[PDB]
Amino acid sequence: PYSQISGLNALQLRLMVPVTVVFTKLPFTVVHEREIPLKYKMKIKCRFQKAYRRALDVQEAEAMLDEPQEQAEGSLTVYVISEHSSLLPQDMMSYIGPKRTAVVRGAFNIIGRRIVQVAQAMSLTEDVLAAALADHLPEEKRRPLKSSLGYEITFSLLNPDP
Considering only CA atoms, which of 41, 16, 22 is closest in space to residue 111?
Answer: 22
How far is C-alpha 140 from the geometric centre of its chain's CA atoms? Answer: 23
**What are the C-alpha distances in Å from 29 to residues 26, 84, 91, 136?**
9, 25, 29, 32
Q: Is the dihedral of CA 40, 34, 125, 61 positive or negative?
A: negative
Q: Which helix (H) or strand (E) holds 105?
A: strand 101-105
**What are the C-alpha distances in Å from 129 to residues 38, 122, 137?**
11, 13, 10
Whole-angstrom distance between the N-terminal and C-terminal Cα of the chain? Answer: 62
Considering only CA atoms, which of 108, 55, 109, 113 is closest in space to residue 85?
Answer: 55
Way the structure was solved: cryo-EM
Q: SS3 of 120, please?
A: helix
